[PDB]
Amino acid sequence: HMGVRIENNLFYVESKNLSLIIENRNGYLLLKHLGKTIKNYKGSNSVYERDHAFSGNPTATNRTFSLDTQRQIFGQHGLGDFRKPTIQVQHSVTEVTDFRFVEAKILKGQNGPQGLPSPHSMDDTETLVLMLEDSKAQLSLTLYYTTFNNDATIASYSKLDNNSNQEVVIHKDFSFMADFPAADYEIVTLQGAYAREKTVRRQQVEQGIFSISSNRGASGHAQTPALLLCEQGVTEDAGNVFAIQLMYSGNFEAFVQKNQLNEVRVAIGINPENFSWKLAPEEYFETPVALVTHSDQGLTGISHESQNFVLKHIMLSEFSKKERPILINNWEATYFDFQREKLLELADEAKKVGIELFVLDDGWFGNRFDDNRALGDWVVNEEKLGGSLESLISAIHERGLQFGLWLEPEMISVDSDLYRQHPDWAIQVPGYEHTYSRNQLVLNLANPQVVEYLKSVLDQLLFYHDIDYIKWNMNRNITKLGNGLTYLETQMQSHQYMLGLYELVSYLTEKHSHILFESCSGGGGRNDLGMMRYFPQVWASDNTDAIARLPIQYGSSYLYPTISMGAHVSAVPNHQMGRMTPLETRGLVAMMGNLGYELDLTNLSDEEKATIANQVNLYKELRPVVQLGQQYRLINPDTVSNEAAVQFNYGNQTIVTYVRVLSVVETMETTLKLKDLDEEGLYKLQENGEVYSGAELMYAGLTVILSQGDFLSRQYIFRKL
Amino acid sequence: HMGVRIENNLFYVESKNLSLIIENRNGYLLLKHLGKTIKNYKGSNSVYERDHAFSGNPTATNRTFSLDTQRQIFGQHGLGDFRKPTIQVQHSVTEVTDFRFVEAKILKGQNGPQGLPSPHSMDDTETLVLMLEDSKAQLSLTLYYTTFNNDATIASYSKLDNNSNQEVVIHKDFSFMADFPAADYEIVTLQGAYAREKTVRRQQVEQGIFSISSNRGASGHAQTPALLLCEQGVTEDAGNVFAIQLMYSGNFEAFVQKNQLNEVRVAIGINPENFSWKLAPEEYFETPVALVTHSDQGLTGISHESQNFVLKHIMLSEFSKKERPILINNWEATYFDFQREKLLELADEAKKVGIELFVLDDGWFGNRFDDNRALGDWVVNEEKLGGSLESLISAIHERGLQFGLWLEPEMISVDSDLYRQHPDWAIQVPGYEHTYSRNQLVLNLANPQVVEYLKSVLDQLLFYHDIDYIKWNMNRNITKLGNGLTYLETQMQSHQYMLGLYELVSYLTEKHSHILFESCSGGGGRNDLGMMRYFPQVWASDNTDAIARLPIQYGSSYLYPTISMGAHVSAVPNHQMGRMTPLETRGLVAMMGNLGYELDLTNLSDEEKATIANQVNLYKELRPVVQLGQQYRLINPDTVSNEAAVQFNYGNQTIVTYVRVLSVVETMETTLKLKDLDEEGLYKLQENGEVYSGAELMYAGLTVILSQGDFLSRQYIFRKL
Numbered sequence A, B: 001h002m003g004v005r006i007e008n009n010l011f012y013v014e015s016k017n018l019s020l021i022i023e024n025r026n027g028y029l030l031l032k033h034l035g036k037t038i039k040n041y042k043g044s045n046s047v048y049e050r051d052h053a054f055s056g057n058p059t060a061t062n063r064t065f066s067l068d069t070q071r072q073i074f075g076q077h078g079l080g081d082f083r084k085p086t087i088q089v090q091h092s093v094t095e096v097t098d099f100r101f102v103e104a105k106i107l108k109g110q111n112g113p114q115g116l117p118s119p120h121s122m123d124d125t126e127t128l129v130l131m132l133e134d135s136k137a138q139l140s141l142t143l144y145y146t147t148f149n150n151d152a153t154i155a156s157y158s159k160l161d162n163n164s165n166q167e168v169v170i171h172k173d174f175s176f177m178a179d180f181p182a183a184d185y186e187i188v189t190l191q192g193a194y195a196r197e198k199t200v201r202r203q204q205v206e207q208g209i210f211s212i213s214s215n216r217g218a219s220g221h222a223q224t225p226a227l228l229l230c231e232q233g234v235t236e237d238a239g240n241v242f243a244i245q246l247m248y249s250g251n252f253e254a255f256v257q258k259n260q261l262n263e264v265r266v267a268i269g270i271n272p273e274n275f276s277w278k279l280a281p282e283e284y285f286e287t288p289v290a291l292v293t294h295s296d297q298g299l300t301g302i303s304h305e306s307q308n309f310v311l312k313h314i315m316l317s318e319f320s321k322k323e324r325p326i327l328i329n330n331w332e333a334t335y336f337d338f339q340r341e342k343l344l345e346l347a348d349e350a351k352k353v354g355i356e357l358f359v360l361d362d363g364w365f366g367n368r369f370d371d372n373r374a375l376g377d378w379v380v381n382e383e384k385l386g387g388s389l390e391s392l393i394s395a396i397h398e399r400g401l402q403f404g405l406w407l408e409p410e411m412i413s414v415d416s417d418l419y420r421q422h423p424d425w426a427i428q429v430p431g432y433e434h435t436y437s438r439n440q441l442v443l444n445l446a447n448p449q450v451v452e453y454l455k456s457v458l459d460q461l462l463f464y465h466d467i468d469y470i471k472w473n474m475n476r477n478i479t480k481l482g483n484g485l486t487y488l489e490t491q492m493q494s495h496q497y498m499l500g501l502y503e504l505v506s507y508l509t510e511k512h513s514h515i516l517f518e519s520c521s522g523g524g525g526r527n528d529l530g531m532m533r534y535f536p537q538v539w540a541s542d543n544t545d546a547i548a549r550l551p552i553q554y555g556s557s558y559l560y561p562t563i564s565m566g567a568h569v570s571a572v573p574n575h576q577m578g579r580m581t582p583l584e585t586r587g588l589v590a591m592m593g594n595l596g597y598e599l600d601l602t603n604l605s606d607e608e609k610a611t612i613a614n615q616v617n618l619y620k621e622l623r624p625v626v627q628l629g630q631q632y633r634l635i636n637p638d639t640v641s642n643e644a645a646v647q648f649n650y651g652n653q654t655i656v657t658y659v660r661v662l663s664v665v666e667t668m669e670t671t672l673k674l675k676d677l678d679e680e681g682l683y684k685l686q687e688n689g690e691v692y693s694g695a696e697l698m699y700a701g702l703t704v705i706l707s708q709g710d711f712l713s714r715q716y717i718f719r720k721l
């Protein structure tokens, strides 16, 4: 049985194959167990209470009880625990609180923080409600833990109520924390950089504090809101992993602290940097949702658990199991230099090769002839489009293609009518020059007038035009915070910006629910689970190099389903890397993702056109396997590997893609073994017609043969008989 | 003072900054110290003698003296030492010997084993002669250790005399052995493969036995006769290294054994595999020369020590400091498909770009139109050469080029007149079919008639033709050993083959000492210090890819001077790797070696011709710096590095070559610091005219800037003012 149970002083939060067991000890909440299901928990792994030097106590006479040494589910500073705190509220002359458990409730079905992205499809869930109070400060903190009956994930968030007669200020308020017992641990995170997104990083947990964080106002290219605490020696196939993740797209921190006793604290939430939150009497603050996910089946186990939870409970139901259109995007194809003739000719070529959707990228609005002006001016450039957008769309529709359109609503150019009319709408500090980034500024979405304006302009665009798809961009990070009437309002504006964004995108995605919205932030600059609540695919990276895409796709699909992961076949030499790669390899690499095209089809040879038509035909066949199937990493593209290989299973279809980076000589061929087949199953390999048992493919494997050369690839396609 | 000293029961072998101190303990020889100079040695690091269980004793009553636990300089089996032995002689019913020290002598000046390559320029050397006897077996073993006054190297070899009235058989006889005290050690070796020669390998010394060996009858592509025993944590710049090397080109073994007490034995010599040696009464056997070289300046220290010793005492004096000609070789250019017109046209183009030497590769002799016939038939194909070789050579000379010629004297084709006349000259076993390799057979150079024939044919070729250069090839390994009249003669034939080879090549190189002989064995299949005694350069690898050449050159110049290391600019796509690389990078990579050219100059554009002419002009300038200067590795090309950088210093000239393998994006530029400059020196960088102090270049370093793209390179050229 799954759900929530209250049994004497234990609370059991029971998801599928994952339990959190909390003990109420005289108002203090102790983490007894987080991990595989245990019923009738007795306490075999309880903390041994002893006098630990310099670890102090809530009472004078009992030296062996200390919040410095108890395992907890939230952290305070000032009561004897010196580990990093996760709740810290200023009230009167102090930022000491002492929240004590008073009452527990259980909810059933949907719930979550208002104004923030949270799980859906929650009918078969229960939520533990732990009501804590600080009687002196007259504050309440309420913790929520939600079970899921179909996934090894628990969701968490909290609400802080000010029940006092004075203003209070939240300084720290994370979404999840767990104290894990001293043991050897490794951590996996996804970091990297622009054009190197979601680089998989693994390291040993060491004494001290390790953290990843964004202070950019977006989660960022260089860190993902995820931290995987792993059993020493974890592999793809074996060992315990706990993934903590955050459904938030602004400033966040994830940290792991190893203290003086070798104990380990992990937490994730809103970054303390650039954050404070004023609460007037009777006001409350709810944190974004955190997730804790578990597998005992290594890193592939955690990928599957995380992907499944995302597909079922985050990504929009309307799209989570819907094959996504193969698109053409004109950006790398033309940049800003296009007009109607060029567009329809590209559309003609796209239709001939069987592409499904035509996306008009940057440059269609205002006087956007380059990237130095016009953001904020969402007026159609009818001169450039050679008539109305309506007439363009009709043209695209009549050629048999869906129509998509680029927006960047959060941004404003100094050189724009919007800025001329409302210069105060930009994020800025009185008496300081702007800081520029791609020669543009960020709109203050903490300003309700800004949100109202964007809802209006965009609702107008979407209702008056037959648009099938939106690409929602965001091309710089936030500087010069000073739009508040007070310092505290400025400290709130980064989170209020996010609330404004979510109000905006939840409104539009809900009001226009037939439209496929793809998120973007110079590629993967905001590829997190907050955005994926509303945008069921993401432009994974501006780097469209087939080879540079290998580690990027590795990371981008590590916790997120492949279906989310936009990938385009682009021109050579590649625009980012300056590299020639075979068209075959560009195709096979993009086909490990959500396939599209981004090159000038009108300038290709007849042969290159035929190749792309063949690629499109192939992917129409593989699309369900890739987008709806189960992903298995076989060879990981990292810093030292010269190879990449990824398998997908879906019913009677099994495919495997193999890529080799550098040509090798006098080196024995790799043996590549498949996973998760029926030993007794019979698998017919398309290329040679041979039938192999699943046992053979899994335990003997394929001798991988290639010619001489860099960046070569091949694909194996099997049908189970 | 350096040289040899005998002081009571200590013998001191004293080279520059390296001493071997041996103690005579009642006929047993103990290794007291090998390492930095110590005078007046007292024995601070003596073995503590105790009863070690299962370590037995030469006398009944003294359980604390055991050859199982004493550090020694040669190893026997059967007297209580169970570490791997380095001398083992069968006599009568046993292969137990008990060699006991009887007498020491000191020689001055040159000496070495007859018939085997050994150091030259030995006027300032002394040799310790340790005469050992086994009175029962009536055998003598004499050990030789030679000092050098200008290098931290000691040379060693031994002679075994049969003074008995019966035949005896040597089963094991290594050239050097040392027992090192228990400590943490790493080892560096050079292994790899064909087209991947001299791959630098580093690992921890572990309990048990690690070895590299050849049983191929040549030292081989996959292992070099070298083993570096290193202090834990050695770097390029710091820590103790002991390099043991062998001046031999046949079957060898190097091993490191960590025993039950954590002690470490290292040895190098003739491989026991495929070796036995019969001695009739009064006959003797001398082993090849081993070298032990030391540095306390890390791996660059050992490179310098090894290179210096090779330049001064191995490589021919006639060439060791002589700039080597920039050559054109036609092999990759035409393969077998050439005639006189094509040759002279290539020669014309070579002259225009300033090339100095023209080498005619395979296919000029017998009916060698492919690689399936004619080896053994060293008759000029006057039809193919369009007249006599004499007339061809005159033509090449008149165009201003030296002339070079390809030979493979050790080999015979089934389809050849030589085989038709003397089928028994091939290495073979009566009643077994041939084993084939590149469809050719190996000549039995253990057969004195074979050696006489080759001396004659080749002396004739060289005296009747004005040849400036020879490329001496050897394109397969030895199979089917059975040419002996007895089993024992067969067991001797692999070493006798080597003696035959050395007799042949010492004769020809001496009799034709103006000719530059470059050794070759499908590239680096026999690139060892035995060959380098007679052949002052070597074709480092058939792999002429600029990028694949990086780890190859790293290894090929690790212990051997750059001047030895043949490197050719070749065509793209590269014939081995199937890869396009910039001509600039092919040039800069080959210029880190001994530069030549190997592509069809007649088929290049006018631009590619101008580029090569520029490369030749440049290298004429850099040649002394590269060939005669001091080499400093700055970034090593290994399995994980994406970079390579090598510096050369020579008087007032400092150059640095940098190569990046894969294009990178959003990655901060590398900072490359130079080494071994004068802090106060002023260094003018050619490209920008800026003057930097040596301190700046060494301690701040160069920000390395590149455009986008794979396989890019650049060079920095400095002049000290």
Ligand SMILES: OC[C@H]1O[C@H](O[C@@H]2[C@@H](O)[C@@H](O)O[C@H](CO)[C@@H]2O)[C@H](O)[C@@H](O)[C@H]1O
Residues within 6 Å of the ligand: A131, A140, A142, A159, A161, A163, A284
């Ligand atoms: O749910 C826990 C809290 O409940 C009460 O306040 C809530 C407030 O948080 C918000 O949900 O608005 C509703 C509307 O009725 C309630 O006022 C308590 O005041 C808090 O102390 C806390 O228990």
Ligand SMILES: OC[C@H]1O[C@H](O[C@@H]2[C@@H](O)[C@@H](O)O[C@H](CO)[C@@H]2O)[C@H](O)[C@@H](O)[C@H]1O
Residues within 6 Å of the ligand: B131, B140, B142, B159, B161, B163, B284
């Ligand atoms: O040099 C040590 C040996 O000297 C004597 O033999 C040598 C022999 O090795 C070889 O060098 O030929 C010369 C020619 O006179 C000598 O015979 C002893 O017979 C050996 O026992 C050994 O001492």
Ligand SMILES: OC[C@H]1O[C@H](O[C@@H]2[C@@H](O)[C@H](O)O[C@H](CO)[C@@H]2O)[C@H](O)[C@@H](O)[C@H]1O
Residues within 6 Å of the ligand: A331, A361, A362, A371, A406, A438, A473, A475, A520, A521, A522, A523, A539, A542
């Ligand atoms: O402007 C259209 C373009 O926007 C985003 O990419 C850009 C990139 O082209 C430019 O070079 O840099 C900025 C940041 O400096 C952005 O990354 C989209 O990601 C891209 O797909 C395209 O739509």
Ligand SMILES: OC[C@H]1O[C@H](O[C@@H]2[C@@H](O)[C@H](O)O[C@H](CO)[C@@H]2O)[C@H](O)[C@@H](O)[C@H]1O
Residues within 6 Å of the ligand: B331, B361, B362, B371, B406, B438, B473, B475, B520, B521, B522, B523, B539, B542
């Ligand atoms: O035959 C001339 C050729 O000999 C050696 O190379 C060859 C190589 O070309 C061929 O492909 O393989 C055999 C072994 O199978 C040899 O490696 C020389 O090294 C080369 O320079 C050339 O002279």
